[PDB]
C-alpha cells in the first residue's frame, strides 16, 4: 500500500520526525474526506454493474473482515468475475474510474479451460472515515 | 486516479469549501513527503527493480513506455506502461511484488492477451504503473 512504501523509505528522509508527521497529516486528511462524503450498497451495485455491463459472470463478492488505520477504515471486498480478455479489461477500467472511492490491488487469473474465458479473482477496498 | 475520485465526488461534500482544503492539504501533505526523498531520482531505480522483478517472475520484457508527465499543484506523475510476457500465476506475482517495492509507486489499469492461438501458457499484459515527485 502507499502508506507502506512511504514507511519502508522513511530511512531516506532529511527529518525524520517530520516526514512522520507529513504522513500522519497525509491519512488525517484523508479521514476528513472520507467524513464530509454521504456508499457499500451503492459501490456493490456500481461494480455489479460494471462487470454485467461488460460482458462478464460474477460468481462472488466477498466482503472481507475491515482494517483499520488511525483515521480511515479499509474495507476489502474480494471479487471474482468470469469472461473474456477485453471484458475483463473494460471490467478493470470501469471499476477504478467509478464515482467512489475504491482502489484495486492483487488478482489472480487462470483459464476456464487450460482463449476466450479466463477467470479473475481481484481484491478491491473501499474506506470511511475511523 | 484517488484525486479524480475526490474531484468527481465534490459535489457530494456537505461543506465544498471545507473539502477542497483538504483535498488541498492531502495533495500538499504527499509533495512534502515525496521532497523530503531523492525522488527526482527514483525512476531509473525504479525501473531497475520493475526489470528485476519480471525476470524474478520469469517474465519477459517486450516494452517500457514513458509517458507525457502530468502536474498537479504539488506532485508530478510519471505514468509508465509496462508489456510483459509469461505464464498466468507469473503475471500476478509480478503485479505483487512490483507493489511490494519500497518505492513510491502504484499500479493501475492492465489487460491481458494470449499469445499465440491455442496457448494460455505466454500471455501477454500491458499494465499502467506510476511514479510521482515533489512538483
Given at each position: 500500500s502507499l502508506k507502506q512504501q512511504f514507511s519502508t523509505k522513511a530511512f531516506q528522509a532529511?527529518?525524520?520526525?517530520?516526514?512522520?508527521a507529513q504522513m500522519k497529516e497525509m491519512e488525517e486528511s484523508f479521514g476528513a474526506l472520507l467524513r464530509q462524503?454521504?456508499?457499500?450498497?451503492?459501490?456493490?451495485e456500481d461494480i455489479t454493474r460494471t462487470g454485467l455491463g461488460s460482458g462478464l459472470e460474477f460468481e462472488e463478492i466477498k466482503l472481507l473482515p475491515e482494517v483499520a488505520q488511525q483515521f480511515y477504515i479499509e474495507l476489502?471486498?474480494?471479487i471474482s468475475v468470469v469472461?473474456?480478455?477485453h471484458d475483463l479489461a473494460?471490467?478493470?477500467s470501469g471499476v477504478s474510474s467509478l464515482p467512489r472511492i475504491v482502489t484495486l490491488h492483487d488478482f489472480?487469473?487462470?483459464?476456464?479451460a487450460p482463449t476466450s474465458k479466463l477467470r479473475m479473482?481481484?481484491?478491491?477496498?473501499?474506506?470511511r472515515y475511523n
Amino acid at each position: 500500500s502507499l502508506k507502506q512504501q512511504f514507511s519502508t523509505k522513511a530511512f531516506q528522509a532529511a527529518n525524520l520526525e517530520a516526514y512522520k508527521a507529513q504522513m500522519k497529516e497525509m491519512e488525517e486528511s484523508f479521514g476528513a474526506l472520507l467524513r464530509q462524503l454521504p456508499e457499500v450498497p451503492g459501490l456493490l451495485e456500481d461494480i455489479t454493474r460494471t462487470g454485467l455491463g461488460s460482458g462478464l459472470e460474477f460468481e462472488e463478492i466477498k466482503l472481507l473482515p475491515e482494517v483499520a488505520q488511525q483515521f480511515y477504515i479499509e474495507l476489502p471486498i474480494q471479487i471474482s468475475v468470469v469472461g473474456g480478455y477485453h471484458d475483463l479489461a473494460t471490467f478493470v477500467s470501469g471499476v477504478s474510474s467509478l464515482p467512489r472511492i475504491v482502489t484495486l490491488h492483487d488478482f489472480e487469473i487462470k483459464p476456464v479451460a487450460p482463449t476466450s474465458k479466463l477467470r479473475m479473482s481481484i481484491l478491491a477496498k473501499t474506506y470511511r472515515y475511523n
